[PDB]
Amino acid sequence: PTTVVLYPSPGMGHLVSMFELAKLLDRHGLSVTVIIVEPHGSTAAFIARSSASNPSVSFRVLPRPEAHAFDLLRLSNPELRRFLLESPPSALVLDYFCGNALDVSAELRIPAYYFFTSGAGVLSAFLHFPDLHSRTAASFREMGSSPLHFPGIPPLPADHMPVPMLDRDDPVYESFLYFSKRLKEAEGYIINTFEDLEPRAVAAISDAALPPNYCIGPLIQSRGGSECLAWLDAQPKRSVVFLCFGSIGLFSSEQLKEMAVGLERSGQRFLWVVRSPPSEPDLERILPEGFLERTEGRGLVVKSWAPQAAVLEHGSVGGFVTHCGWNSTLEAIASGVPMVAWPMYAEQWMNKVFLVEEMKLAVPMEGYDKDMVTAEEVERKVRWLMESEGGVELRARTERAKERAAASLAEGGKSKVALLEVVERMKRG
Numbered sequence: 001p002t003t004v005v006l007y008p009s010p011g012m013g014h015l016v017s018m019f020e021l022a023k024l025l026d027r028h029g030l031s032v033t034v035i036i037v038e039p040h041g042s043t044a045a046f047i048a049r050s051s052a053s054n055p056s057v058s059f060r061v062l063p064r065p066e067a068h069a070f071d072l073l074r075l076s077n078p079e080l081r082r083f084l085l086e087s088p089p090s091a092l093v094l095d096y097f098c099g100n101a102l103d104v105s106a107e108l109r110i111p112a113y114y115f116f117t118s119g120a121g122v123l124s125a126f127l128h129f130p131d132l133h134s135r136t137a138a139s140f141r142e143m144g145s146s147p148l149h150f151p152g153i154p155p156l157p158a159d160h161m162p163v164p165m166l167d168r169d170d171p172v173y174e175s176f177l178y179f180s181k182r183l184k185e186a187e188g189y190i191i192n193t194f195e196d197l198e199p200r201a202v203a204a205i206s207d208a209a210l211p212p213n214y215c216i217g218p219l220i221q222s223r224g225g226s227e228c229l230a231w232l233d234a235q236p237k238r239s240v241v242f243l244c245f246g247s248i249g250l251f252s253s254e255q256l257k258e259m260a261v262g263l264e265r266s267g268q269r270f271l272w273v274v275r276s277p278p279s280e281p282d283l284e285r286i287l288p289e290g291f292l293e294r295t296e297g298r299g300l301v302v303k304s305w306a307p308q309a310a311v312l313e314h315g316s317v318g319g320f321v322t323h324c325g326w327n328s329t330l331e332a333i334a335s336g337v338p339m340v341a342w343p344m345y346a347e348q349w350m351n352k353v354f355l356v357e358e359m360k361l362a363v364p365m366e367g368y369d370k371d372m373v374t375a376e377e378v379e380r381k382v383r384w385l386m387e388s389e390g391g392v393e394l395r396a397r398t399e400r401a402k403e404r405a406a407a408s409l410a411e412g413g414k415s416k417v418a419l420l421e422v423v424e425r426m427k428r429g
C-alpha cells in the first residue's frame, strides 16, 4: 500500500482542507497520514470525527516544541524528520507555509508536492513574487495601485497583495519570500482549481522551467443551522441574496447599518450572516432600530454562522454577496450562484480581481478598498444581482462555470485526469 504524508500548516482551515485531499487520495487507495502541528476551533474534536467517519485516514500529532505559525513550523522540523525516518513515505504533500519541511524531504529523498488551496492565479503571483521583489525597492503599500504584472493573470493593484506582504520591513514578509522561493523546489503542484475556470492561469505556470501542476478541483468541504435551511425552503426559487463573509467578521457596527439600510431598501429577500464587530453578536444593539421587526418575513439575519455549502446548493438562492474566500468561491461556482465580490482579508482582494476581470463570474462591491461600503452601493448591487439584465447575463456565465466544473470532475474530465496523473506519479519512486 502506497503511503503519503500530508503536512498542513497549523490552523483548522488548513487542516480541514488537507483532510479533503487526504480522503481523496485514500479514495484512490493510498495510506495517508495527516501530520498535525497544534496552535497555541478544536483539534481533538476534529481528529475524533475524522477518525470515526474516515478510519483509513490516520493522524500523527507531533510533540509541540500568521507569525507564530511560521515559528511553530520551522521548529517542528526535528520532530517531523523523526516520524518520516521511522517509515519513509512515497510522497510528502506540503502547504505553501510548510517550506521549512522541504529541508527534511531533501536528505530523506522524499518527493514533495504542494497542496495549494487558492487558484492558479494566486499561485502565479506567489510564484513570481520573489522576482518582482528584487526588481524594485518599493514595498507594495507604497506602490498603491501601481500594476504588478504577473504571468497568466490580470495586472493586480499592488495594494491588493495580501496584507502580510505589504511591508518589506516586517519579518512575516521575509517568510513569504522564503515560502515563495521554495515553491520552485517541489516535484509538483496540486491546486484546488479546474483548468477551464482558470485556463490562461494554468498555462503560464504550466511552464517547463517550473514543476508540473495537477488541477484536481473543486475540492469542496461537503439548531440554528437547520433553521436557515427551513426558512430558505419557505422562499420562492432563486429569490434570496446570501451575504456571508468567511471565518472572521471585520465589519464595524456602522458598516453593518449601511448593509441593513441597503438591504432593506433593495426590496430583495436576504439571508445575511453577521458576526460580532471587532474589538456572540447583539443584533438589536448592532443593527438599525426596527430593522429586525421591519424585515422579518422578508429576510433572516444569522448570528456568526450558517451552513454555507448547504445554503448555496439551495434553489432559493439567486445571488451571493461574498468575501471571495477561495472555498466560498468554489462552493458558489459549483452551485452556479452568481456573486458580488466584497473581499476583505487574506488573499481575497487578489481573488476578487481574478473573479471580476479574468474569470468574470462576479461584479465588485465598490468601497471594499475604502473606509466603508455605502447603503447606496449595497442596495444598487443587490438590485443589480436579482433584477437587472447584467445579472441574468452574469447568472448565465456562472451556469457555464458550474458545468465546466461538474464536467471537469466527472470521469474523463480535466481535473479527474490530473488527479490520477498525480496519484500514479506518487506511486513511482
Ligand SMILES: O=c1ccn([C@@H]2O[C@H](COP(=O)(O)OP(=O)(O)O)[C@@H](O)[C@H]2O)c(=O)[nH]1
Pocket (backbone or CB within 6 Å): 013, 221, 244, 245, 246, 247, 248, 273, 304, 305, 306, 307, 308, 309, 324, 325, 326, 327, 328, 329, 331, 346
Ligand atoms: O458562516 C459560515 C462562513 C463560512 N463557511 C465556510 O467556511 C469556508 C470559508 O473558506 P474560504 O476560503 O472561502 O474563506 P476564509 O474563511 O478562509 O477567509 C467555506 O467552506 C464556507 O462555506 C460556513 O460554512 N459558514
Ligand SMILES: COc1c(O)cc2occ(-c3ccc(O)cc3)c(=O)c2c1O
Pocket (backbone or CB within 6 Å): 013, 014, 015, 017, 018, 096, 117, 118, 162, 163, 164, 165, 327, 345, 346, 347
Ligand atoms: C481556509 O483555508 C485556507 C487554506 O487551506 C489555505 C490557505 O492558504 C493561503 C491563504 C493565504 C492567506 C493570506 C495570505 O496573505 C496568503 C495566503 C489562505 O487564506 C488559506 C486559507 O484561507
